[PDB]
Structure formats: structure tokens, C-alpha cells
Amino acid sequence: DPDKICLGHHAVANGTIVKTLTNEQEEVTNATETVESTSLNRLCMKGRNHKDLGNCHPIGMLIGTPACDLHLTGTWDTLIERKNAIAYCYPGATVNEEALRQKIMESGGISKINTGFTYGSSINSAGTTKACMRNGGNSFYAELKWLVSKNKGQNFPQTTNTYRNADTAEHLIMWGIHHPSSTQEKNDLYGTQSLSISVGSSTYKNNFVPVVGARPQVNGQSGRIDFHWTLVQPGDKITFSHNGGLIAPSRVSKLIGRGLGIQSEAPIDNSCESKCFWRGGSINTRLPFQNLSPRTVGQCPKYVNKKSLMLATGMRNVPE
Amino acid sequence: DPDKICLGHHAVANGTIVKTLTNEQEEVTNATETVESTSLNRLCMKGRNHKDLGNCHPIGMLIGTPACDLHLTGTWDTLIERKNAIAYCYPGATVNEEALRQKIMESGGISKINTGFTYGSSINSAGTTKACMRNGGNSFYAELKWLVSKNKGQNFPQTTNTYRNADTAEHLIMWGIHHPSSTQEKNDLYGTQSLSISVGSSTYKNNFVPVVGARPQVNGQSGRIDFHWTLVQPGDKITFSHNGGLIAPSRVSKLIGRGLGIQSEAPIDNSCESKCFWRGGSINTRLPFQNLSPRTVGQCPKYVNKKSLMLATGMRNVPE
Amino acid sequence: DPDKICLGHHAVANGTIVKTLTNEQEEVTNATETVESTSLNRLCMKGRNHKDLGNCHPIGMLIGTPACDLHLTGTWDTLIERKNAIAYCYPGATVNEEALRQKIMESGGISKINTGFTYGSSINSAGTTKACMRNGGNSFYAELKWLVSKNKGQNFPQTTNTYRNADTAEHLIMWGIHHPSSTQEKNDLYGTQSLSISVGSSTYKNNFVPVVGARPQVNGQSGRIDFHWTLVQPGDKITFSHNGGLIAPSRVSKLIGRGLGIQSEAPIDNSCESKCFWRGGSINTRLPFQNLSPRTVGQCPKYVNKKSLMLATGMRNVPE
Amino acid sequence: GLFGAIAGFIENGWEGMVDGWYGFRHQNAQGTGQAADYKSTQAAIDQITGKLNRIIKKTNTEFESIESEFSEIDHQIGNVINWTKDSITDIWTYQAELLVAMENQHTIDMADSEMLNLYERVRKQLRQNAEEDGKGCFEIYHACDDSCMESIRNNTYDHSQYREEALLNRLN
Amino acid sequence: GLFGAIAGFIENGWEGMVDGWYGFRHQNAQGTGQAADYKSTQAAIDQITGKLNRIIKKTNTEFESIESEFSEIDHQIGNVINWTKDSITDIWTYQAELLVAMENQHTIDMADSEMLNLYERVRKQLRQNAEEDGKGCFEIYHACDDSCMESIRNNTYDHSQYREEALLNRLN
Amino acid sequence: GLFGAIAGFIENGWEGMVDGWYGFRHQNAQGTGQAADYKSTQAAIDQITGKLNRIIKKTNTEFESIESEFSEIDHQIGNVINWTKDSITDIWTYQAELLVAMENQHTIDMADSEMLNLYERVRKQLRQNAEEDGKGCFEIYHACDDSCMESIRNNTYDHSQYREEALLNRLN
Ligand SMILES: CC(=O)N[C@@H]1[C@@H](O)[C@H](O[C@@H]2O[C@H](CO[C@]3(C(=O)O)C[C@H](O)[C@@H](NC(C)=O)[C@H]([C@H](O)[C@H](O)CO)O3)[C@H](O)[C@H](O)[C@H]2O)[C@@H](CO)O[C@H]1O
Ligand SMILES: CC(=O)N[C@@H]1[C@@H](O)[C@H](O[C@@H]2O[C@H](CO[C@]3(C(=O)O)C[C@H](O)[C@@H](NC(C)=O)[C@H]([C@H](O)[C@H](O)CO)O3)[C@H](O)[C@H](O)[C@H]2O)[C@@H](CO)O[C@H]1O
Ligand SMILES: *[C@@H]1O[C@H](CO)[C@@H](O[C@@H]2O[C@H](CO)[C@@H](O)[C@H](O)[C@H]2NC(C)=O)[C@H](O)[C@H]1NC(C)=O
Ligand SMILES: CC(=O)N[C@H]1[C@H]([C@H](O)[C@H](O)CO)O[C@@](O)(C(=O)O)C[C@@H]1O
Ligand SMILES: *[C@@H]1O[C@H](CO)[C@@H](O)[C@H](O)[C@H]1NC(C)=O
Ligand SMILES: *[C@@H]1O[C@H](CO)[C@@H](O)[C@H](O)[C@H]1NC(C)=O
Ligand SMILES: [Ca+2]
């Protein structure tokens, strides 16, 4: 008999489950994901003045390893290190290796400055090795010189070299100490005298004694060249007192500004953009969370221990 | 025809915008700020037994630099360190410098205890320098003695000094190792012999060899005095075996209780109170957040990356 | 005159106070605690292949202190260290002590491998001490050898010993350096010549100088034996060049898998299970928070600065 | 409260009602009665169970020792650890205080809502045969025996049966 | 739910209604009809858009590497880093689980509220000319043609024009 | 909003009403009047006070310096500290943005609820002696003088006194 006007709301055949404060299994009309599971196995480098070191290890660009010849200077906002990158052609280690690497990867370029260092007639500065090949023939680190006596067996002269920082910014100086494989080898290069290398600045001081002893061969060399480094403040000088066994710097390095340091194995794509990176590649999502890796760099979604978190975008689904 | 009664709510002409879960631009009748933007460029030190070190560096109070003569002892609940504060008149560094400074700034006072150390007639304990001037004339660190041979060039005697902690609380002992600028300088002060400084307690053990090598002048001195320190437990002894190059302690230090350590450039105001401080001054807000600095000390509002967060204190404003 | 049907809700005489967004003192019908205050002063070790070191310090199981004889090898998923545990019978310290201890407590077992080292007829390798008593008589660390010549005071020969890792996993090698109390005792063991210990592998290299100096007695000995350690990679050798003062390993150690490291004073109970532990014992709660200690290990409720947080499990209580 | 039912137009709760959270009391010629509502009681309890399931939980993350109980840690790294742990504890203390306060506000208002929803379900059943007391009761303008009252509780009461009687009694 | 409209006195939703979230079905002499309500639909969608704008976002904070991928870190600082990262991840996992749960509860209850507010707007329009069905329908006690029904949907229905007819039909 | 009262069926607020948050306007033969409701105003203010007490607070945790202002820190520990501080700040920024957004949503909806609860209290008082306007007003179907209006505001109005007059005026 009486006319009816009814009120109601939509529904859908295929509803979605979401979690609420009170219910683990709540069916709603629509939902969207908040946690990214998908990765891109590429380094999205569009709008980035990037530098792919490839075979070159970051420490290598300061000492000038053959592998790092293309990467001795320049400016970048992003620097990419690869797996099993070569730092030392001739076998050796760097004191505070990790501290130095982290410092380079933080940087946004490298400038080189000539030390000016000159040597007497008795000193040969062009000492090379078969471990560091360049242009097919024997060579050495491009930013250092191997100092040896010209006359086999002759005692190395007590020389003193001093670098002054004329610049307004701090400069990174690296040097090496050669450790001979035998007593005979030591005597032919630096003479019969006991060796002492003293380094001195306003902020740094240290003595180095070349250790001489038989050891297993690495890259066909029983000898070791261990690297050391320090910062030289503006207007300050650093003095090297040595009687043989010092690997002296031809050039010092200056790190310029700030940049993003990426350790990854993924290929470069200059077509896509990204602000978030990890070992496995890039993360381009607008989503607020991700479950790919807790090790990420740049502006990144926060890592969560969740496969999925579904955010309701519609009312309860109540079907007929 | 009919009498009516209408129900309603207040409104205001000039409403305030706030953010809700669903709306970025929501107008309400009133709101209050939750993020503090305003700073006081002063150190509010009312109800605080404070100590302004000024020119004196905290490490300087332990070794007794000229600048720290007023600050060699005392009690405080708050300790204020300034920029370019002087620790070392004679050039040098302290091993675990930052660890020691943090320890002093945590403390609420320093007491001094005489070590009692005596030396032979062949040792001169009154060795001074032009780098540490006091009362117009050459002098040294007030809590240490520079030990040198009385007859120039003569070998320094193999002396042994032992400090025992008679107290019920741990004592902080500091000593220095002199590093000469040349072989000539070394021989005149400590003699031709090879130098060894051995330090030994129940909980600490170390050998020190004076490094001798040419280096730049700092405060007109090519020589370096590097400081070392350790804690000596109650009832325990620490023994110095040295044949020259040791800078021996006249007094040891005892850190008393707990205090708040502030690094700031801001002037002191004894009229206002505060529990939160930073480089730029104090923060007196009742508000739960602040965007002045992430580097703060005391009971502090949490740092947020937000200019403003307005908290609604009234209903939606719907005006006429 | 007209019949009535009334609607209503339950209540209780004794209600519970809870905090809401708007009210500090809100009475509700029921509530449950979310913060655990109760502790169990026992280590719940049911379903755990545990190892209680008791008197034995974890470093002691690598060098084989008398106290650690039962604990020289084995496998575990949980390892328990106690207070004042004996690391060394003979007075001394380990370089990177804390790094090594943390590494052992992380492990889930230790295997031992013979170094195989043999010595000439002129050397006696059965040299013992009174500091390390075993079977009623004088003895030494079970995994190291102290050997001396038949002539006391004779100069120690410049010997070279090499351990090779035949295994497919990395091995942890420990050795000790003796530091005599006086010049007399430095001469009697290793002779008048200056003592130098060189260690060399592909990945490790270091020189050590025996320090000789007077120091307090610990366990009735002024002499010190400091332990040093390094990892030896599979297929690699480690070479010890020494002229006396080196305490050589009979066996090297191999850490197996992963385990939970607990530092506690509490007794063991094998009847109860737990995944959360602290100094004072275990925490078996289903609750999400705890206020017992911020230092906990395992899968743990999060530490909060709250006596109690009551979670309403019922409506407002409105009594009659 | 948000919905006005509990600590609102209903003046107080019933200590007498021990077999449910929400329910009915009736008076008619034949005498008095009390009965709990199951559907609305179970709705409230199920929602609170759900909260307890989500909140009474720890993470399955395995944490190792970084501080030593029985030895000195380096003073610098010790201060870093202390600053980090105190910062994490301040966050968890805040999250815990906020979680429980927010959930308590919701639990209270949810329970209020279930009371109101029952009252509205009954109001609409009785249609023109009853009037609102103002205190959570309905004055029914007809003879409603215990079988009639049971029909209201069981949502089977047909208004059309008593409409003519009720409208006469109401208009008077 | 909180407001009782959806999964409440309205027994189920309409798969038929694809042009809006909320709307009307009517039956009169003239036959049947269906129409979506725009104002109430857009109110719900606008509120959900607002949530997505706030939640689908990352911080603009630049983070650097502190662990090395291709080399061993000091074991002590490595353990400190591992403890910190695991603690931060536990917090963010908790915040993410709580954010979405809390927002889901609100979205559902907000949508329920919009349904109820439409039903109340119509109830007050019809005044004494209609009675509540109990299932979200209004029995109208007069001839309501397609022009009359459209006036109810468009909030232009004047009760005074049909009042005399309606009150007679209701009192019978 | 959630409860439909404010920015809902009540078209706008009253800038005129400065002595309270919620209140009444009446019109009768005797003229016009305005009065604030204390109980409902104080209920809203008390709930907002409670929020400010909980939110306007800092932790009583004492923090020490871990970065030096006036000297270089070890590069490795410096990077760890920087990463930790940035991570903690991202959390606190998120919590602060969420706290205030969530509390603002609640404050608005709470104030809406107090308006609705006052309207429902009055509706139930007037019983059958009045009808809902639709815009938050009640058309009273009897002579209601200033003493009668004051009785409605003071929750002392007895419906039975005016019932017979009112039901006659309503039915006509
Ligand atoms: C120029 C001349 O013939 N004689 C004096 C010079 O010594 C001096 O020039 C500087 O001398 C420096 C060393 O001087 C001291 C010092 O630090 O002040 C003098 C101290 O008495 C001596 N003290 C002790 C306990 O040994 C101290 C110490 O040997 C060194 O600091 C150790 O490193 O040396 C230094 O050689 C400079 O190179 C030189 O400029 C001038 C300066 O006024 O005065 C002359 O009287
Ligand atoms: C008094 C005397 O001249 N000789 C005997 C003393 O040795 C002994 O007094 C104690 O001597 C201790 C050091 O002696 C040893 C030891 O630890 O027992 C002797 C060991 O042969 C020697 N072993 C090895 C492998 O090197 C060992 C070792 O060199 C040192 O421990 C290194 O520091 O030293 C110690 O100094 C005590 O403080 C001292 O009292 C007495 C009483 O037993 O008997 C004397 O005949
Ligand atoms: C810090 O955490 C990571 C993972 O929890 C540890 O790295 C792993 O070590 C094991 C055994 O060497 C490897 O099999 C895994 O593949 C590693 N996983 C990752 C993701 O790196 C690391 O050792 C921990 N660091 C410390 C010092 O405990
Ligand atoms: C400057 C110099 O002398 N270089 C020579 C070195 C060194 O003499 C010592 O061997 C130290 O390694 O030896 C080589 O065999 C080598 O390493 O490749 C040949 C090389 O020409
Ligand atoms: C830490 O951050 C501050 C501010 O961004 C910067 O000045 C400093 O160089 C950083 N420290 C390191 C070691 O990266
Ligand atoms: C409330 O208003 C009435 C109506 O005039 C007045 O007479 C009475 O005194 C007031 N009631 C109370 C309890 O104050
Ligand atoms: Ca501290």
C-alpha cells in the first residue's frame, strides 16, 4: 500500500582483506599496498653527474693505479664502487683503509696538486715493477715515485722533502713504505745502512722502519708496499725525513664537496631517475615502506619486516 | 505560528588552519604550537653551581696549563667548554683525547693528590720551556715535571717511580712522552742510549719509545709532548720504568660525582633556569618538540624537521 | 499505566583506573597490564643445548686455562659467562680482548686443530709455572707451549715456525708474548740480545717488541703474558719469526656456527623455557613491554620507563 | 562519551546483570524481568579480543649483547651506546603510552556505540507503539506480556499487531 | 560498526549500484528506480584521497652507507650498527602496522558515518509524512511519484504540502 | 563530520555567542533570547585540557653530548652517529606529524559529538510536544514563555504538562 524510499551503499563481488585495530580478517571494497617488494636491477642515473669506477677501487684513484687512470680527477655527485675492484697492483695494505674509502665515497670530486718534490743525482725516482703494467711495459702508481739508489748496493742519501698547503682547504697526502723480500734485495736498493722514515706535520708525527723478511708471493711479488695517509691543514707543511724505503708522493689529493657513494653490482641506466639505491639496484616507489634490504642509501622508504600491509581505500564490503 | 528553540555552537571571524588525518587545510576556532622555533642566546644557570672554563680546555685542568691555573680543582654540577680553549701550551696530542674530555665533562668536580715522586742528583726535574709562560718567566705544566739529565749529553739514569692509590675511589693518572726534533737534541737531554718508558699497573701495561724526527714548528717548538692516561683502582699501584723521555706526574687527578657538560659560545645569565642547552644557548619551552638543533644536552624537547605543527584546541570554525 | 522496557549495560563494584587521550583517571570494568615488572632469577634453558662456563672465561677456552679444561671443545646454541671468571692463570692481557670475547660468545661451538710444531733436542718444551696448577703440580696453558734452552741466560736462536690451514673454513690462531719484570729475568729466558717477534700471513702482518719494566704483582707474578690473535684463511700459512719471548700454540681454534651469549649470575633451571635473558635472569612474559633492564639479549619485550600501563578490556564502569 | 549512551542518557550500569555486557529490564502487569543481549555483548568482546591479539606480542628479532656486564667498554663507544639505548627507550615509552591511551579511548567509545546501536534497533522495532523515556527506557502503549517482551529481545516483534491499540493509548 | 548503518541496520550492499558509493532505491505505483548520492559519495572519496596524500610519502632525509658491502667492518662497531639497525627496523615495522590498522578502522567507520548522516538528513526532510522501516527504508504515507522521489534525493521535498494526507493515512 | 552536527545539519556557528561553546536561541510571543550551555561547553574544554596535559611534555631523560662542537670526531663513529641521529629524527618527525593529525581529527569529532548529544538530550525532553526543524531547531507546538524556555535549558521541562495542547496543535 505505502510507497518506499530505501537507502543503501555499493558492494563488489571480489572484496579485499585488510587488518584493523579489532579484526585481522576485514573485507573492504578496495585496498592499496604500502610495502614495496619489487626491485629494479639497474642504477637509475638520469639527472646525475655520476662516475662508474668499474674495475677501479676508490683508494686507487688517490695513488693512481693503472686501473684508475681515467678516474685520477674530475667532479661527480654520485660515485659507484664495484665488487673485487683493484686498489693495489703491487701487493700491500693501507692503514685505516676503511676510514679512507668512506671519505672518498662521501666526496663529490678529486683535484690533484703537484708536491714539487725533487731528488739528488744519487737517487733514481723512476723505479717501476712488473705488478703495475701500463702501455704494455713495467710502471708504477701515477701519483707516487719509487726512490732507489742509482748505483746498486750504494747507501741511499739522507734526503728531506717538505710539502706546504698553499690552498684554503685541507689536502689529503698519501705515501708508501716498501718492505723488501730479502736482506740482499734491501742492500741493492737502499744500501747496508739501517733504514728510518720519519714523517712530521703540525697535526701528525710517525716513524716507519721497513720490515725485511721472506713471505708468500702475491701477483708474483714477495715484497709489500704498505700505504699511509693524513690530512694537511691549510698553511701547514708535512716533512719526510728518509734514508731509503719511502714511496714519496708526486701529487696530493683534494676531495671537493659532497656526493652519494653506491656499492652495487647492477648495470647503469641513464633513462630512469631514482633517489634510493642498494646492492641489488634502485627503488623508485612512491610507497612509504619497503622489504628489499635494510642496507640502502639516499632518500629511501623505511625498511619493515612485512611481506604486505594493505591500506583500505573503501567501506566494508557486505555482499548479497 | 509556533515558538521554536534552536541549538548551535560558537564561531570566530579569524579562524586557524590545522592538519588532520584526512584534510591539510582544516579551519578551527583556536590552536596552539607544538614545535619550538625561538632560542635564548644565553646559558640559563640559575640554581646551578656552574664553572665557566673560558680560555681553559678541560684536559688542561688535569695537566695544569697556565690558562687553567684557576681551574686546577673545585666542585660543580655544570661545566662549560668554549671554542679555541687551550689544552697544550707546548705542542702535542693526548691518546684517546675525546674519551678523556667526555669523562671530565661528565664529572662534577676535580681533586688533586701528590704522587710524591723523587729523583736522583743526576736528574733535573725543573725543566721548563718558553711555550708555557707563567709569572713572566719560562715554566711547565703545573701537575707534571720535565725530567732531563743534569750534565748535558750524559745518559739519563734508569729510575723507577711507583704511585699507590691510598683512597677508596679510582684516581686518573696522566703522564707525557717527549718526542725530540733531532738526534742532537735527544742526546743532549737523555744521552746516547736507546730510550724505553715502561708503565705498569694491575689493569694497565704499555711501552713508549720516544720518536725522534724533523717536523714543523708549532708555538715555536719542533719538539712534541704526547700525553697518555689511565685509571688507577683503589689500593693498586702504577710503576714508571724510564731511562729518559718521560714527563712524570707531580699530582694525579680524582673526578668527583656527576655533572652536565655544555659546549657553547653563548654568555651566562644567572637569572633564568633551563634543563636543555645547545651550541647557540638554552631552550626553556614546555612544548614537546623543537627545530633549533639535533645536537642538544640535558632534558630536551625532541628534534623534528618541521617549521610548525598546530594542535587544534577548539571545534571546526563555520562562520556566518 | 504503560508497560516499560529499559536498556542497560553491566557494571562492577571494584572498577580499574586507566589513562585515555583525554582523561588520566578513567574507571573501566576490567583492564590488563602491558608492562612486565616480575623477573625470574633463573636461566630457563629447556630445549637449549647450553654450556655454563662457570669459573672459566671464554678467552680461557682458546688458550686452555686449568679452569677451562672441561670447556676446551664442544657445540652449543647458548653460552653462559659468569662474574670474575678466570681468563688467564698467569697475569696478562689480550690485545683486542673485548673483540675476541664477543666473537666467542656469538659462536655455537669450538673445534681444536694441532699445529704439529716440533722442537730440537737443545730446547726443553715442558717449561711450566706455579701460576697454572693442574693435577696438584706446576703446569701451563693446554693449547700453548713455553720452551727454553738447557743453558739459562743463553741467547735464544732466531727460529721460524709456519702453520698452514688445511681446512675449508677460517681458523683462529692465538699466541702469547712474555713481558719480563726486570733485565735479570729478560736475560735468563731469551738471552742478552734484543728480542723481536714478527708474524706474517697473506692478510695479516705485525712486529712485537717484548717490553721489560717493573710493575705490581698479580697472582704473585710481576711478569705479564699478553695474548695476540688473528684469523688464518683456508689454504693460507702464518709464519712466526722470533728470537725469544714468543709463546707458541700447540693447537689453533675453529669457531662453529651461531649461538646466544648470556652474561648472568643467576642459577640454571632446565624445566622452564625462555627466549629473553638479562644479568638478573629470564623474562617469560607474553606482554609487549618490560621495565626490568635495558640490557637484554634474545627475542625480548621492549624496555620502557613505566611502572605500569593498564589496557582497558571493558566499557566505562558507572556504578549505582 | 562520544555516542552519549554510557555515562550519558543511561544514568548508570547494572551490577545485577552478570550474564552479559548489554541487556534489558522490563516491567508489565505480570511483573519484572532481566535478560542479557548476546549478539551485542559478543560484538564488544570480539573487538577487545582482536586488540589483545595485536598488542600482547613481542618482535621475533634476535638481539645480541653490545655492552659487557663484567668489563669496561671504550668510554667513547660506551657513551654512543648509552645515547642510542636512551633514545630508543624514549621512543618505545612514548609509543607504549600513546598505544594504550588511544586503544583505551577507542575501547570505551566502541562499547558506548554498541549500547546506542542496540537502543536504536529496539526504537525502530517498536515504531509508533512506544515513546522514548529519555533514560534509555521505552514506555510501551499496550499490554506487553513476557512473550511480547521476549519478541522485542529476539527482534521478532511485529508493530502492526499492536499499532491500533497503541496509537489510541498515545493520543488518549 | 561504530555508527550502525553499514554491516548494521542496512542488511547488505548493492552490487547493482556502480555510479556511486551511497544512494537510493524507491518503489511507487509508477514502478522501481535507483540513483546514487553525489555529495555523500564525494565526501567519503575526498577523505580517503586525503589519507593517501599523507601516507604515500617518504622522508627527504639523505642517508649514507655505514656498513661496507665488499669488506669486513670492525667486529665491535659492526655489532653496535647491527643492534641499532635492528632496533630502528622493529620501530618502523611497529609504526607501519599501527598506522595502517588505525587508518583502516577510521576509513571503515568514516564510510559508515556518511551513510548514517544521509539517512538522518532524509528522516528529518520527510518529518511526519513517513516512518522508519528498520532496514534503512522509509514507508511514505502518500502518493510519491518520480518527481516527488527526485525532490527527496535533491533535498527540496516540502513536508507541509503532503502533511494532511500523510497524517490521515498514518492514524488510519 | 562523523556525527553530522557541526559543518552538518547545523548550517553555521554563532559569532554572537561569546559566553560558551554550545547553546540555545529561542523565539516566542515574548520575543527572542540567547543562552550558552555550561555542562556541554565544560565537557568539551575538559577533554581538550586533558590532551594538552598529555602532549605538552618532554621526557625527564638526561642526555650527554656524543658529538664535539669544537673538534673533529673519528670519521667512522661520526658517520654512525650521523646515521643514528637522522634515523631517530625521521621517527620523531613522523610520530609528531601523526600525533597532532590524529588528535586534531579527534578534537573536531569530539566537539561535533558534544553538539549532537545536547540536541538528543533536548529532543527526548520535548518528547511529542515538538518536531525537528532539520537545521538543529525544534518547532514547539504550544505557548512556551521565557520561564518554559528556561525549563528546557535547565533540563526541568515536564512534557506531560503541555502534552494534550501540543498533540492537538500537531494533528490539527
Ligand atoms: C739562540 C740561542 O743560542 N739560545 C736560546 C734558544 O734556545 C732559543 O731558540 C729556540 O730554542 C728552542 C729550544 O728552547 C727550549 C724551549 O722550549 O724553550 C729551552 C728550554 O729551556 C729547553 N728545556 C728543556 C727542559 O730541555 C727546551 C727543550 O730542550 C726543547 O723544547 C725540546 O724540544 O728548549 C728551539 O731549539 C728552537 O728551535 C729555537 O728557536 C731562543 C728563543 O728565545 O732563546 C735563546 O736564548
Ligand atoms: C726465589 C728464587 O730465586 N727462585 C724460586 C722462585 O721462582 C719462587 O719464587 C717465585 O718465583 C716466581 C717466578 O718463578 C717461575 C714460576 O712462575 O714458577 C719459575 C719458572 O721456571 C718460570 N717458567 C717459565 C716457563 O718461564 C716462570 C716464568 O719465567 C715467570 O712466571 C715469568 O714472569 O717463573 C715469581 O716471580 C714469584 O713472585 C716468586 O715469589 C720460590 C717460591 O716458589 O722458589 C724459589 O726457589
Ligand atoms: C651483522 O648482521 C649481518 C646479518 O645479520 C651479518 O652478516 C652475515 O654473516 C653470515 C656469516 O658470516 C653470512 O652467512 C650472511 O650472509 C651475512 N648476512 C648479511 C646480510 O650480511 C654480520 O656478520 C653481522 N655483523 C656482526 C659483526 O655480527
Ligand atoms: C725500482 C726497482 O728496483 N724495481 C724492481 C723491483 C725491486 O727491485 C724489488 O724487487 C722490490 O720489490 O723488483 C722487481 O722484480 C719487481 O718487483 O717487479 C723488478 C723491478 O724492476
Ligand atoms: C655529520 O653531519 C654534519 C652535519 O650534516 C657534518 O658537518 C659532518 O661533516 C658529518 N660528519 C661526518 C664525519 O660525516
Ligand atoms: C532550573 O530551572 C528551573 C526552571 O525555572 C528553576 O526553577 C530551577 O531552580 C532550576 N533547577 C535547579 C536544580 O537549579
Ligand atoms: Ca656517561
Ligand SMILES: [Ca+2]
Ligand atoms: Ca657523512
